[model samples]
Target chain A: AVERTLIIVKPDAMEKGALGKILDRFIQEGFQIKALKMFRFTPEKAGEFYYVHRERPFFQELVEFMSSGPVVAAVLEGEDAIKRVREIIGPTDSEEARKVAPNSIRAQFGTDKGKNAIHASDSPESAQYEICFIFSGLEIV
Target chain B: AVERTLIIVKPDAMEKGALGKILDRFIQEGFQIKALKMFRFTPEKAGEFYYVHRERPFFQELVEFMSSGPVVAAVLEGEDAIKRVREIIGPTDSEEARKVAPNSIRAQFGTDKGKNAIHASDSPESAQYEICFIFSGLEIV
Candidate 1:
């Protein structure tokens, strides 16, 4: 079963100059790169993409940070792509991930729960939505 | 405000031929390409990467699948990179993600729970460890 999912290289990661290493892991994991782009989010666009979190306390911060710089968004394809990708990323909280799942992505690069490095889709529905949101008519086949 | 994280494009996607599209997303998102490489994981390396899942029933399968083909690995840097990237990817389960987070990455391209799409670091600590594991001795600055 082949699959695809959206991924982003956040502003923090880009600022640190870690993009190349991040991409290396994807290729090593056997996932195929489908679609990719770099975008600087305006506050409005960031708010739109993160609409679900609009009610959350951290919503403002999320939007501000996203809009502050450029972010790399990508669509990845493969078998069991969603779950496998999650496995590699580990937990949502970086400190917790480092304590228990130290081998995970967050554990190694993340600064805190809110700043945990990297993100992956929770399910197929979001993947499609995100892909379309960023790709905007870009082909994924 | 700067952070670093790990990301991987797995095997299934590679076989399906989605690499170029995937990379494009990162560049578009403003992530600075750091280190990058294509690698074929030997069983040993694959096992090590998924060592945390050793107790899981799917451990063997995970190792075998990861070792089955070449993958891309990379490191990305930016501000709040970890969290922002996670938002773009969305939920873990594709099917479940499709229902609520239709715009997520997994929802759009993920095939199933086990074969979603991509992998990303969950924290700063893990990102550091993972980068060393794969790049060993390579400079990240």
Candidate 2:
């Protein structure tokens, strides 16, 4: 079955000029890209977008890092896209990803936990929610 | 001094999986991309976005073509960015572009008149309007 997921190339990767290099990996891997863009999140929007964690103590810090620079966002489609993408991105912790999946996106570009190289939807529900939050219905391919 | 312009990687290029290659050109040419995204224009919005030509006869056809597929839009910045970008993209007509600037994105990817490979803002005013039309203030880098 074909599935979809939202992907975000994080601030650290953008600042380091890894945007193109990172984008290439997915296309090269043969996933169908439905939508794509590069934009900076405002701290306000970041907080709102991550509102599920509103009650968490790290929410503000997460917002700060995301709003620090520009990020590239894309909608990708493939079989088991969400699960497969998560695997390709490795873990949420860059250190863990580096040790466990040395070839993963996070392992190569991420420097720390908050600076993890990219964001992939954890589930189908989050994928729809996050995709809608960033893209309008008309934006999809 | 910095200036900005709007760019559109037309459906022709996007369909051919040329999005990454086109993006590489701008970055390699030293233009700083400010915002970027892929979106399919609804005919209603396409007509509205190109309101300047609404009174002309070919307006509806232009709208139809633009609304036919997904396009990658972006805000690019540089010194004399508007004019420089126009030069790089060559002429508006693909056949003409192929003869005049065979290396241009349009020349390489475009197949016909309305299917030109890309669109670059023709003036600063249009740039501001087009940029704001598709992207929000908070999305800029």
Candidate 3:
């Protein structure tokens, strides 16, 4: 199904000056950054996005990092966007990414496994879940 | 000496969709982007900028990648600005930066020695040369 995915330009971009390049990638690749803004996410919001992963051990760390600094929250839309953009972002850790997926976007800007450059939904189901937490009643086209 | 440095956002930012946030950094830092345009540079201009280093092993490699896509060029000025900016940029190699300078700009966005994100003039003198090459005197700040 045609869907929209949620991606977050983590705090690292703000500190390191990678925000432009990261967002530029989505825009250039023809994904619409339907909504974009820089604000520190509330713990409540981060918890909602990572709800399913709550049982995981790193869940707290994940949410902490997401809300720690200014993050650019965006809703990107296109065909198979959830997977296509994840591939572009590579893995969750920059170290592993530097080897396995050297060309991935995460490998370029991510801090580590927990502080990966950007976050994207894993599947269409999650895409729906994640996108809704950030954007409200938006059209899917 | 007071100097001006040429820094490019590169096609990566435009492609990623983060131009405005990226500009925010320079704006907040008080660095003026003197020549702002979205365009690709010809091979000749790329070669001319690195002419002094043409004999270096990476000269050809550098030219090839730079001209591979569109890059945003801006002339930034401040007191001892050339060195100041270069120091902030860290090393030409991101790997080295990741270890010694985690907070450095390159460590944050650069992929490797070949794909380090941004570039800055090496010295005050060369900054003058690079500035004239990219912008007119009126654009100099």
Model 1 per-residue lDDT tens digits across residues B26-103:
666776555555566788998887777789998888788778866777666777887766665567676877887786
Candidate 1 CAPRI category: incorrect
lDDT of 2: 0.86
Chain B TM-score by candidate, in order shown:
0.85, 0.95, 0.84
Among all windows of 10 consecutive residues in model 1 chain A, the one with the lowest summed lDDT is A15-24
DockQ of candidate 3 relative to the true structure: 0.09
The residue-by-residue lDDT of candidate 1 on A1-141, one tens digit each, is 788887776676666545545655776788866665555778998898877789999999888887887666667778999888888777888888888888776777677766665767778888877778777553343
Tens-place lDDT per residue, model 2, B1-114, is 679899988888777777777777888788878888888889999988899999999899999988998888888889999989989998988899999899898898888788
Off by over 4 Å in 1: A137-141, B1-141
Cα lDDT tens digits, model 2, A7-118, are 9999887766677667667776678789887777889999888888999988989999989988889999999898989899999899999999999999998899989989
Clash count for each candidate, listed in order shown: 140, 0, 15
Question: Which digits, one per residue and each the tens of the lDDT, describe model 3 over residues A37-139?
Answer: 3446677788878899899999898888888876666777788788888888888878899899987878888878877778888888988887777666632
Which candidate, 1 or 2, would have the higher lDDT against the true structure? 2
All candidates: CA RMSD (Å) = 17.6, 3.3, 13.0
Q: Pairing residues by index, what is the TM-score of model 3?
A: 0.52
TM-score, cand. 1: 0.51
Recovered share of real interface contacts in candidate 2: 0.52
DockQ, candidate no. 2:
0.43
TM-score of each: 0.51, 0.81, 0.52
